[PDB]
């Protein structure tokens, strides 16, 4: 029999871990940009949700490479295919907005 007395403690620990990540990862938003996804199981197909990472085709259409995209905070998933023009266009637009909003400091 396990009782979740630590629920508040677990939440506090998670918040502290997030704050530590922010301190180490201050400039970046702690999250990788995810694509929009349409679910299977028609009971849920109407719902659109975030995916793991953008497909290689979407990354190519976004004007950047997967290797470079990862270093800028874009999740890349080579397992997902593309079979919907609307979803592909939405992902491309999201990637373009991300590229137009990101600021990258010089390596010098």
């Amino acid at each position: 029999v396990k009782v979740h007395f630590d629920q508040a403690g677990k939440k506090v620990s998670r918040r502290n871990a997030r704050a530590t990540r922010a301190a180490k990862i201050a400039p970046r938003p702690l999250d990788l940009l995810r694509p929009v996804v349409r679910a299977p199981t028609v009971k849920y197909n109407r719902k659109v949700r975030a995916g793991r990472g953008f497909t290689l085709a979407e990354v190519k259409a976004a004007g950047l490479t997967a290797a470079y995209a990862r270093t800028i905070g874009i999740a890349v998933d080579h397992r997902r295919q593309n079979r919907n023009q609307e979803i592909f266009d939405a992902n491309v637009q999201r990637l373009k907005e991300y590229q137009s909003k990101i600021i990258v400091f010089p390596r010098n």
């Binding site: 502290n16 201050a26 400091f105």
Partner: protein
């Protein structure tokens, strides 16, 4: 436990470590601009909003540019070896700008570089020297 009682009874003394307060406090250690403007009184999300930055890219769960200008301004803040230079000069003297003739030089073009590479290297040498 037996060991705990022995340690409490032992005269060695506990190795006391007080760090509970340090868990709440975390100092920024990845940017000099944020550190000057970051306020530890506010939370991560509040600090990001104050600085004018996004702390989450996906729709966050549950209910919810005076500084970015400095970051944008922060964005505004190779040659040839001596032996390579000598090799380029030798070929330039022997063939001038005749890239096709230079390509077939068996005893000066020791490495069979392409016409494009040869012309690019010669242009770089000319720009650097003349």
């Amino acid at each position: 436990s037996v060991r705990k009682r022995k340690m409490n009874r032992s005269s060695v003394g506990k190795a006391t470590r007080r760090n509970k307060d340090k868990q709440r406090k975390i100092n920024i250690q990845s940017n000099p601009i944020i550190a000057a403007n970051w306020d530890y009184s506010l939370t991560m999300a509040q600090n990001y909003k104050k600085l004018g930055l996004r702390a989450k890219l996906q729709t966050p769960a549950g209910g919810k540019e005076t500084e970015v200008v400095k970051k944008l301004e922060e964005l505004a803040s190779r040659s040839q070896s001596e032996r390579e230079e000598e090799w380029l000069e030798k070929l330039y003297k022997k063939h001038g700008d005749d890239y096709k003739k230079m390509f077939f030089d068996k005893k000066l073009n020791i490495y069979q570089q392409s016409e494009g590479d040869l012309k690019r290297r010669l242009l770089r040498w000319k720009k650097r020297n003349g």
